[PDB]
Scaffold this motif. Structure first.
Motif, PDB file in Angstrom:
ATOM      1  N   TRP A 121      56.136  41.789  33.928  1.00 40.87           N
ATOM      2  CA  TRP A 121      55.591  41.903  35.274  1.00 40.87           C
ATOM      3  C   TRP A 121      54.933  40.572  35.643  1.00 40.87           C
ATOM      4  O   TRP A 121      54.172  40.008  34.852  1.00 40.87           O
ATOM      5  N   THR A 122      55.244  40.081  36.841  1.00 46.26           N
ATOM      6  CA  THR A 122      54.839  38.749  37.279  1.00 46.26           C
ATOM      7  C   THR A 122      54.092  38.866  38.612  1.00 46.26           C
ATOM      8  O   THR A 122      54.647  39.405  39.571  1.00 46.26           O
ATOM      9  N   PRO A 123      52.838  38.371  38.680  1.00 48.36           N
ATOM     10  CA  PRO A 123      52.129  38.414  39.962  1.00 48.36           C
ATOM     11  C   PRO A 123      52.744  37.451  40.982  1.00 48.36           C
ATOM     12  O   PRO A 123      53.298  36.413  40.606  1.00 48.36           O
ATOM     13  N   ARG A 124      52.647  37.814  42.258  1.00 49.90           N
ATOM     14  CA  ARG A 124      53.323  37.084  43.341  1.00 49.90           C
ATOM     15  C   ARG A 124      52.948  35.601  43.465  1.00 49.90           C
ATOM     16  O   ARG A 124      53.781  34.791  43.879  1.00 49.90           O
ATOM     17  N   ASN A 125      51.713  35.255  43.108  1.00 53.69           N
ATOM     18  CA  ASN A 125      51.231  33.867  43.171  1.00 53.69           C
ATOM     19  C   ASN A 125      51.371  33.072  41.857  1.00 53.69           C
ATOM     20  O   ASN A 125      50.791  31.992  41.728  1.00 53.69           O
ATOM     21  N   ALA A 126      52.155  33.585  40.903  1.00 51.16           N
ATOM     22  CA  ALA A 126      52.366  32.913  39.609  1.00 51.16           C
ATOM     23  C   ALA A 126      53.028  31.535  39.725  1.00 51.16           C
ATOM     24  O   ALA A 126      52.818  30.682  38.863  1.00 51.16           O
ATOM     25  N   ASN A 127      53.824  31.333  40.778  1.00 49.53           N
ATOM     26  CA  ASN A 127      54.487  30.045  41.048  1.00 49.53           C
ATOM     27  C   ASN A 127      53.702  29.089  41.972  1.00 49.53           C
ATOM     28  O   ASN A 127      54.267  28.106  42.455  1.00 49.53           O
ATOM     29  N   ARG A 128      52.420  29.375  42.215  1.00 49.71           N
ATOM     30  CA  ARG A 128      51.568  28.538  43.064  1.00 49.71           C
ATOM     31  C   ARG A 128      50.380  28.034  42.256  1.00 49.71           C
ATOM     32  O   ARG A 128      49.688  28.823  41.609  1.00 49.71           O
ATOM     33  N   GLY A 129      50.148  26.723  42.296  1.00 55.54           N
ATOM     34  CA  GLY A 129      49.036  26.106  41.576  1.00 55.54           C
ATOM     35  C   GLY A 129      49.278  26.055  40.079  1.00 55.54           C
ATOM     36  O   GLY A 129      50.423  26.092  39.627  1.00 55.54           O
ATOM     37  N   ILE A 130      48.192  25.969  39.316  1.00 55.71           N
ATOM     38  CA  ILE A 130      48.261  25.890  37.858  1.00 55.71           C
ATOM     39  C   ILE A 130      48.030  27.286  37.277  1.00 55.71           C
ATOM     40  O   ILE A 130      46.952  27.859  37.437  1.00 55.71           O
ATOM     41  N   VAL A 131      49.056  27.824  36.618  1.00 59.01           N
ATOM     42  CA  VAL A 131      49.021  29.173  36.046  1.00 59.01           C
ATOM     43  C   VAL A 131      49.459  29.122  34.587  1.00 59.01           C
ATOM     44  O   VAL A 131      50.405  28.411  34.244  1.00 59.01           O
ATOM     45  N   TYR A 132      48.773  29.889  33.742  1.00 55.44           N
ATOM     46  CA  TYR A 132      49.118  30.012  32.329  1.00 55.44           C
ATOM     47  C   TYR A 132      49.613  31.417  32.031  1.00 55.44           C
ATOM     48  O   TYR A 132      49.013  32.392  32.477  1.00 55.44           O
ATOM     49  N   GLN A 133      50.721  31.510  31.297  1.00 53.59           N
ATOM     50  CA  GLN A 133      51.200  32.781  30.765  1.00 53.59           C
ATOM     51  C   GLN A 133      50.795  32.825  29.295  1.00 53.59           C
ATOM     52  O   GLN A 133      51.420  32.178  28.453  1.00 53.59           O
ATOM     53  N   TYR A 134      49.731  33.565  29.001  1.00 48.94           N
ATOM     54  CA  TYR A 134      49.232  33.701  27.636  1.00 48.94           C
ATOM     55  C   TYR A 134      49.977  34.819  26.917  1.00 48.94           C
ATOM     56  O   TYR A 134      50.207  35.882  27.494  1.00 48.94           O
ATOM     57  N   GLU A 135      50.346  34.558  25.662  1.00 47.46           N
ATOM     58  CA  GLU A 135      51.069  35.503  24.812  1.00 47.46           C
ATOM     59  C   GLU A 135      50.087  36.106  23.814  1.00 47.46           C
ATOM     60  O   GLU A 135      49.394  35.375  23.101  1.00 47.46           O
TER      61      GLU A 135
END
Length: 223
Positions: A121-135
């Motif tokens: 599941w991916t939030p809508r603003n994940a492609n805007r600004g600096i975002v980290y996907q933590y595992e």
């Protein structure tokens, strides 16, 4: 059944309490209609994963999207917004948290969907600004969809909630995205490895970086 409950928590007063008390805090505000059909389902120590394969709780690959960088997250773990010792009932309610995502004692994560080639599941603003996907590979936590079943407000979120947060030792890696484009894959050297995990998702073009405290490239964030 057996659960590791709040083992992953960073907030000390939440760690101090018996699991029955934390369970009450999570469910005390549920309406009668919900109480009749729903149970507080802590993730069991041995669970059924999203590909219908039985795995240990610590081998279910969880993901958290967060704008806070590795110099904060690998240092502190995930600390919830509300840490104070006498929170309001709105700040501890699992149902309201799932429904509204208002400030709370919970840290949200989402399950890797192994039946759909590791989609999350991916939030809508994940492609805007600096975002980290933590595992994340953590013990315990509450399975939101299992708890509420057909009453789960947003079941697409595949949510596992951690009251009192998640210790840094349960965070394996982080993908650093700048406007949706990957820059670095961060490796947490303090990750407590349970064994039998798949390799960190990698391309030959992206650099893998082992994190350290106050890493010179480890504080990139929005402001």
């Amino acid at each position: 059944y057996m659960t590791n409950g709040i083992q992953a928590a960073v907030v000390e007063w939440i760690r101090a309490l018996d699991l029955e008390i934390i369970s009450l805090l999570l469910s005390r505000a549920w309406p009668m209609a919900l109480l009749a059909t729903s149970e507080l389902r802590w993730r069991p120590t041995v669970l059924t994963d999203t590909d219908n394969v039985v795995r240990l709780d610590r081998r279910q690959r969880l993901v958290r999207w967060d704008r806070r960088p590795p110099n904060e997250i690998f240092l502190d773990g995930f600390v919830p917004i509300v840490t104070r010792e006498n929170p309001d009932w709105e700040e501890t309610d699992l149902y309201g948290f799932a429904k509204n995502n208002h400030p709370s004692i919970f840290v949200s994560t989402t399950k890797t969907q192994r039946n759909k080639k590791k989609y999350v599941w991916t939030p809508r603003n994940a492609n805007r600004g600096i975002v980290y996907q933590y595992e994340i590979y953590a013990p315990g936590g509450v399975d939101v969809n299992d708890s509420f079943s057909d009453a789960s407000p947003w079941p697409n979120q595949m949510q596992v909630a951690f009251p009192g947060g998640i210790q840094n030792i349960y965070i394996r890696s982080a993908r650093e995205l700048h406007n949706g484009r990957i820059q670095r894959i961060w490796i947490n050297p303090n990750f407590l490895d349970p064994g039998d995990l798949e390799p960190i998702v990698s391309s030959s073009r992206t650099p893998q970086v082992i994190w350290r405290m106050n890493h010179p490239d480890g504080g990139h964030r929005d402001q």
